[PDB]
Amino acid sequence: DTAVLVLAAGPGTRMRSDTPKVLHTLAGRSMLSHVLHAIAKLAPQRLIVVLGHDHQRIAPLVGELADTLGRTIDVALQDRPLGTGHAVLCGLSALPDDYAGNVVVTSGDTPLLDADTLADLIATHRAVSAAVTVLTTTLDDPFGYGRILRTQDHEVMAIVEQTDATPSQREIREVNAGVYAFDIAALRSALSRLSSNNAQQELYLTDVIAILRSDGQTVHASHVDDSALVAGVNNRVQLAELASELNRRVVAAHQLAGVTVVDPATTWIDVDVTIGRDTVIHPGTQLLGRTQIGGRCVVGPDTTLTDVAVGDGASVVRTHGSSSSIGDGAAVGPFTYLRPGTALGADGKLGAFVEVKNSTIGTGTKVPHLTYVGDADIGEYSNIGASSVFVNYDGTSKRRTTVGSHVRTGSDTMFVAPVTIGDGAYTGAGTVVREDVPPGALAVSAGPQRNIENWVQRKRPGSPAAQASKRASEM
Amino acid sequence: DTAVLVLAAGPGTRMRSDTPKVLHTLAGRSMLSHVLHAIAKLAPQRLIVVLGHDHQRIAPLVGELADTLGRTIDVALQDRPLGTGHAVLCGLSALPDDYAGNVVVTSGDTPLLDADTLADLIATHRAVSAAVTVLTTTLDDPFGYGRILRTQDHEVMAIVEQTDATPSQREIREVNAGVYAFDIAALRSALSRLSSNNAQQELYLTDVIAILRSDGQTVHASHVDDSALVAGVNNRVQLAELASELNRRVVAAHQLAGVTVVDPATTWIDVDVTIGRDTVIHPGTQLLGRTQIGGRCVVGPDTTLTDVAVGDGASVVRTHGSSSSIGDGAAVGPFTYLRPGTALGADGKLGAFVEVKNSTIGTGTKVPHLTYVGDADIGEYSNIGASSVFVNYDGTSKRRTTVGSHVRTGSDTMFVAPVTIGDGAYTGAGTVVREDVPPGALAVSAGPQRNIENWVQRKRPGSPAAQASKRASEM
Amino acid sequence: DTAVLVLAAGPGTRMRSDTPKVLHTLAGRSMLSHVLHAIAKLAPQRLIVVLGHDHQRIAPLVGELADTLGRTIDVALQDRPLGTGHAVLCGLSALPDDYAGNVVVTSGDTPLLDADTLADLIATHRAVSAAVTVLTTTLDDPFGYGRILRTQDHEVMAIVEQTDATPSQREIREVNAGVYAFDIAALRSALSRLSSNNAQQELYLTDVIAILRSDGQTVHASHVDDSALVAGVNNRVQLAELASELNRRVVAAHQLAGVTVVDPATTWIDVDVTIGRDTVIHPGTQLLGRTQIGGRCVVGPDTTLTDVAVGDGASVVRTHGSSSSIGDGAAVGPFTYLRPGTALGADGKLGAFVEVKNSTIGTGTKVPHLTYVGDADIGEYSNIGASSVFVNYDGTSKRRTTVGSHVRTGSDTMFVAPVTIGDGAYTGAGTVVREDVPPGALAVSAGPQRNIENWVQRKRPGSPAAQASKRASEM
Numbered sequence A, B, C: 001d002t003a004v005l006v007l008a009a010g011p012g013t014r015m016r017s018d019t020p021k022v023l024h025t026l027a028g029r030s031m032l033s034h035v036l037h038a039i040a041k042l043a044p045q046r047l048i049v050v051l052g053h054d055h056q057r058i059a060p061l062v063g064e065l066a067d068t069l070g071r072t073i074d075v076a077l078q079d080r081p082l083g084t085g086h087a088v089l090c091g092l093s094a095l096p097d098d099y100a101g102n103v104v105v106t107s108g109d110t111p112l113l114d115a116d117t118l119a120d121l122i123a124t125h126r127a128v129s130a131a132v133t134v135l136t137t138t139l140d141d142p143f144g145y146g147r148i149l150r151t152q153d154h155e156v157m158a159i160v161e162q163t164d165a166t167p168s169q170r171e172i173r174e175v176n177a178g179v180y181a182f183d184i185a186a187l188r189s190a191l192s193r194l195s196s197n198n199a200q201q202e203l204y205l206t207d208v209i210a211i212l213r214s215d216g217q218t219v220h221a222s223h224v225d226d227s228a229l230v231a232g233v234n235n236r237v238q239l240a241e242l243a244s245e246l247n248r249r250v251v252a253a254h255q256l257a258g259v260t261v262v263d264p265a266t267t268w269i270d271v272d273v274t275i276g277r278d279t280v281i282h283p284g285t286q287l288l289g290r291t292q293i294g295g296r297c298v299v300g301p302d303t304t305l306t307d308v309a310v311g312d313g314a315s316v317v318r319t320h321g322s323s324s325s326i327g328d329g330a331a332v333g334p335f336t337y338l339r340p341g342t343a344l345g346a347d348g349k350l351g352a353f354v355e356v357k358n359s360t361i362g363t364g365t366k367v368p369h370l371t372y373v374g375d376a377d378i379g380e381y382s383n384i385g386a387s388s389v390f391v392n393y394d395g396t397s398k399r400r401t402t403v404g405s406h407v408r409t410g411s412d413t414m415f416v417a418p419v420t421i422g423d424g425a426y427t428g429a430g431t432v433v434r435e436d437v438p439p440g441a442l443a444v445s446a447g448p449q450r451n452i453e454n455w456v457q458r459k460r461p462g463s464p465a466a467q468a469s470k471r472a473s474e475m
């Protein structure tokens, strides 16, 4: 039986942010969401999140996550950030007085911590009958971590904080993860003995190690070799470092599953994204939120998609797109903008300098060039001519437009919504369509061409164009 | 006298691909092409590629490469992938029974192997009179490689595979490259003694080392310090790692030759690309296939060019382009798409939101804005006005259009192919050109402007525009 | 009292450039500017730059920097590049014969050298009463650096150049920074004893170490642990390596100050750029020259801005822009090009496939799609319809256009400069505006739509459009 406490009530001042630290994101989830997902998978009997100033801004997000993960998550409040040891005291207050399960503690700023690591911790703690088991790792750069102090026979004696450590203790590269398992009576007893006479004037959870050792209680350190899983994030430098590591792991998982990622270093993939076999992702690409890409696609370079579904065999190149679907075999890009509600059918095409918003575009239909399609429904196997605009907006209002199948509209056509263009209709180049066009009708509005002979000689006399028409006249 | 065998008949299952492993690419060539280029330069008397299931999909590519490299390359078939030792047996079958040259063996998945490394191997093998000389290297991460086992006086005893090695042998960081030279009689004798009682149930080439040592035959290991040259690719993670290393080497060669590459990490350059002195390449750029860039150019950021020739002093910025030429001093981008058959003359300009396909554009001509130029020939020193379209396609058909020199066409002109615009002609803004325009003529079609006074007060009563025309009326 | 000499008169042949080596840039400044900024902050009594062939191309840049930094900087000429020791001789020639201050020497190709490092050097030199104090560091790859030779009790004996060192001395990883402090009499005495019998046939400054040791003079080495601060740049590979390191440091400083930089590896920030709290920078972004970004902005991905000011809460996404201002809360991108002189007001919008040049755009005004705005002034809360062009240029000439506030212009409107559009006016879709439009007028020019019934059956008989109008006719 285990209760897990997540300490998320510190001020987060080193982030230098007006957004609460635990709400900063990597790979499409906040640090707090990563931590609560990992813990939820372990499925402890109790899950308590300690929150501080704000709490009004974080507790709702906690309750949404409890619903998503299908379990209750209690919030305990810590009124002032008196230190990690005091935050654990506040967390214990959400437990019955008589609670007898183990207590696991972790921080809200260790976002790569996983279920397996927690399960190993609990298993080790139970096996050695420890009063306290602390996860540790070894780092090239241990700055800012609590240093593990061992006796000559390698017994863990104490954890010393960066601010409290001597220059010589600072050289210690074995560090405290800040993930612990405790015997609850031993934890309560040690917490009642903390004092705050240290460099930060705080009540440090870390002092419990030395306090329990004082009592001749069993103190066990469990070394996590994969240091990233317990790396902490106190500032934005560490956040981006850990985001980069998580992203390499996500990309690698896709590569081992059959996805070619040309340049993992410049390919950002959020945790919920799925990608089919033999897709190729080119450099400079981000796949974000719940994007799903099918098999044998080509995506990128320089593509950003958030919540976009892409079928099999599609090409989505130099495209910026959100909340849209792209059908099997469709071709999007280069230089294409998809705004929410865009649905392009199979074997559709949206080409360069095209923007679509809130429009459905049927199977095999092509909008190849320099056009804006807004609030419109277009049928199958139609062709929209270059440099056209679906005019939704009359200065105050916005309306719908329907274009049928096998239509061929001429370049530079403006469709002033709402209008209906019937199946197989055409429009001339340069048409302003303000009324319905029957099936198989040709709609036109451009006036006839008139040539004004020798205009250039008269109105641009002695210009390079005048000399040129003169020169062409002679030869 | 030497025969080289390339083993390329394994299933490649760890790639999780429907494309044969040896056909996956880096820096513009398949792994197999890289390996056969390296070997061809060494110029052995015989070159035999062992192929498996598929072979129908790979052998043609081999024959194309034989023609390109100007030499014969024999294919030997291995019907089932019974292991590397069996693949060598199959390869030997393409040699005469009485063959007496050395036999060199390498894999199709070691794509950075170079001619010099092979020549050193053969030279070392001949010098020590070895029965077998095996290339080895030392790696931080030796996962998946055969481990080199040495006696106490550092004699090579055996190679143990990742799957067959003990936890303690797995700690060995000296690894088998899988590149060997053999005395042929000794190779044939050892291969006849292989058995498949191991963790993979395969006939391992690697066992020949221990078998030859058994016979008191000379076994020599030659350590390659530059580990990348013998790194292998069994999955897409390793493929992208080795692609990134190869790319750093290609970029570095350009930098040492006089090319500024601002960010090598985000600048991908294929092996056949050439780049002139004092060109600057900005981040996020890929130069692919047979692209050639001249001297003093500026390329990028965010440019992708495949088979594009760019002259000296040109700027090609945020451009996506293929099978096109860009003249000396020309300016392309930002946000410009070049499709195949685009030829832009010296001091030409193709600006933002411009797409060109299959068009020739003469010296000094500018197409600066929001325009599509398809299937058209344009002369010298002409100016195409913003937001124009060369309409090639009439719904069923596509035709040509010719525009002369020193022409100035007005914004929003549509050129309905085929039409000819003579030298020094002009078009008005908003013209639809459906007929020829003589030299120095002005072609027009837009109707006259009419102002409807107080329309906004009548039809948008109490709108912010109505209040504003009211307010401007008073003051 | 101290005089600093910067040696910048070598040929720079390893750069393979027609641009003088010390003029190559990183993070928005030349190597020479970085070095003179660092030295200027230290504020020595004398600052002398030794220049060579060229000097005509570099000395003006030196004088501009002297004015900027508010101090004199003397140029000494070295006619031929006879070596670093000869360049110091030439530099001393700009000092009085009787000069008694310390002499500090550094190269023009050590561009991360900082004021603190120089101040520590001078402080150490004075403390130990050294004749010569040389800065050293230790490197994994010491190729091309002078190697530090020490006796058995760790006394510095000599510096040996890469070209002159034995294979075994080349293994030495402690290297000469080429930054020194000297007692001036001891320096002059040692320089008069240099000879050029070495591998480069040059007069090496580095020999002064052994010469002074000969005289039993005090020689002190001061180890700089942060090796980047004294890394040198002899070729473009080293230049990009040091640019990447400097850039990581600049980015890190922003992150610690409150800026989220999602991907430091692909975010290039020049030294003079400022960025406000809680701004987020997305991958693939360069912020260059004197760009200033306010707080809570979103910038990128794939954005390049040079000398662009962006207010607070603005979004500037996939934008390529220079010498422009973007107001508070404004939205720019994706796929937007800003040319110099663009000023967008607060809560303005410039959307996809929009280019602006030399135009002012007032508070709350939107230019959302496919439009070019050149040489124009637009008022507040106006809306420019999609696919429009401000036509500045009549084939020979360019003029102004003024658009008032609360105007709503129709899609596909061409504004033939110069024209004035009054407050609250409208234009129809497809209008060519060649004359002034009063406040609250509606300007139009497009002809009426005509539908030609059954045109497709007659002129595209048996086409998929004809069959479709037939099929829609029946059902």
Ligand SMILES: CC(=O)N[C@H]1[C@@H](OP(=O)(O)OP(=O)(O)OC[C@H]2O[C@@H](n3ccc(=O)[nH]c3=O)[C@H](O)[C@@H]2O)O[C@H](CO)[C@@H](O)[C@@H]1O
Residues within 6 Å of the ligand: A007, A008, A009, A010, A011, A050, A078, A080, A081, A082, A083, A084, A085, A086, A087, A107, A108, A109, A110, A144, A145, A146, A147, A159, A161, A175, A176, A177, A178, A204, A205, A206, A231, A232, A233, A234
């Ligand atoms: C004294 C202590 O515990 N130090 C550990 C803490 O350091 P570190 O300095 O990182 O501690 P933080 O300030 O980040 O606090 C840890 C967590 O506790 C929460 N919090 C903090 C103070 C408070 O009064 N209330 C509260 O709830 C924070 O929100 C954070 O999630 O984590 C590091 C691992 O990442 C360990 O190496 C350190 O040994």
Ligand SMILES: CC(=O)N[C@H]1[C@@H](OP(=O)(O)OP(=O)(O)OC[C@H]2O[C@@H](n3ccc(=O)[nH]c3=O)[C@H](O)[C@@H]2O)O[C@H](CO)[C@@H](O)[C@@H]1O
Residues within 6 Å of the ligand: B007, B008, B009, B010, B011, B050, B078, B080, B081, B082, B083, B084, B085, B086, B087, B107, B108, B109, B110, B144, B145, B146, B147, B159, B161, B175, B176, B177, B178, B204, B205, B206, B231, B232, B233, B234
């Ligand atoms: C048993 C063996 O040789 N192991 C070596 C092989 O491991 P590794 O596990 O990489 O071996 P692969 O499966 O990649 O086989 C090597 C090559 O032989 C070909 N192939 C394989 C099986 C077959 O029946 N037919 C065939 O032609 C494959 O196509 C590939 O090109 O290369 C590594 C270096 O990269 C070495 O460290 C290993 O010691």
Ligand SMILES: CC(=O)N[C@H]1[C@@H](OP(=O)(O)OP(=O)(O)OC[C@H]2O[C@@H](n3ccc(=O)[nH]c3=O)[C@H](O)[C@@H]2O)O[C@H](CO)[C@@H](O)[C@@H]1O
Residues within 6 Å of the ligand: C007, C008, C009, C010, C011, C050, C078, C080, C081, C082, C083, C084, C085, C086, C087, C107, C108, C109, C110, C144, C145, C146, C147, C159, C161, C175, C176, C177, C178, C204, C205, C206, C231, C232, C233, C234
């Ligand atoms: C002989 C010498 O000094 N070697 C040092 C020099 O090597 P390194 O080979 O880098 O020397 P450079 O050729 O780069 O010369 C150093 C500087 O002196 C200037 N210059 C050079 C030659 C000349 O005749 N006139 C002149 O003014 C160059 O412009 C450059 O700024 O710097 C390295 C650190 O970066 C040190 O490890 C080397 O020990």
Ligand SMILES: [Co+2]
Residues within 6 Å of the ligand: A107, A109, A232, A233, A234
């Ligand atoms: Co922390």
Ligand SMILES: [Co+2]
Residues within 6 Å of the ligand: B107, B109, B232, B233, B234
């Ligand atoms: Co392999």
Ligand SMILES: [Co+2]
Residues within 6 Å of the ligand: A412, A430, B412, B430, C412, C430
């Ligand atoms: Co028009």
Ligand SMILES: [Co+2]
Residues within 6 Å of the ligand: C107, C109, C232, C233, C234
């Ligand atoms: Co140098």
Ligand SMILES: [Mg+2]
Residues within 6 Å of the ligand: none
């Ligand atoms: Mg704190």
Ligand SMILES: [Mg+2]
Residues within 6 Å of the ligand: none
């Ligand atoms: Mg296998």
Ligand SMILES: [Mg+2]
Residues within 6 Å of the ligand: A387, A412, B387, B412, C387, C412
């Ligand atoms: Mg138009």
Ligand SMILES: [Mg+2]
Residues within 6 Å of the ligand: none
């Ligand atoms: Mg030199």
